[PDB]
């Protein structure tokens, strides 16, 4: 039936959306903490190379 | 409104695609963060002894 499929697919769209948005904030989150992680890395190698 | 399947079936495999690809960027992010902050160990060792 067209209703049934229909409904079916309505159901995944909106359970895919929200996955897909929790995705997109992790994702954004877990760069965010790249980018400091490697900050980090680059801090303590002037760091050391200063006192060194 | 004829289109309407359709439509749903197009939303559904882009939806799905898109979910693919953020896993896939996700798990390859959590692995380099886990690898820069292993490298944040790692030279606070070296550190310490110095």
Same mark, same amino acid.
């Given at each position: 039936? &067209?209703? #049934?499929?229909? &409904?079916?697919?309505?159901? !995944? #769209? +909106?359970?895919? /959306?929200?996955?897909? *948005? /929790?995705?997109?904030?992790?994702?954004?989150?877990? /760069? *965010?903490?790249?980018?400091?992680? !490697? #900050? *980090?890395?680059?801090?303590? +190698?002037?760091?050391?190379?200063?006192?060194?």
């Amino acid at each position: 039936d &067209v209703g #049934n499929a229909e &409904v079916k697919l309505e159901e !995944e #769209n +909106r359970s895919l /959306k929200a996955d897909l *948005q /929790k995705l997109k904030d992790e994702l954004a989150s877990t /760069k *965010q903490k790249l980018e400091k992680a !490697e #900050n *980090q890395v680059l801090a303590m +190698r002037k760091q050391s190379e200063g006192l060194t």
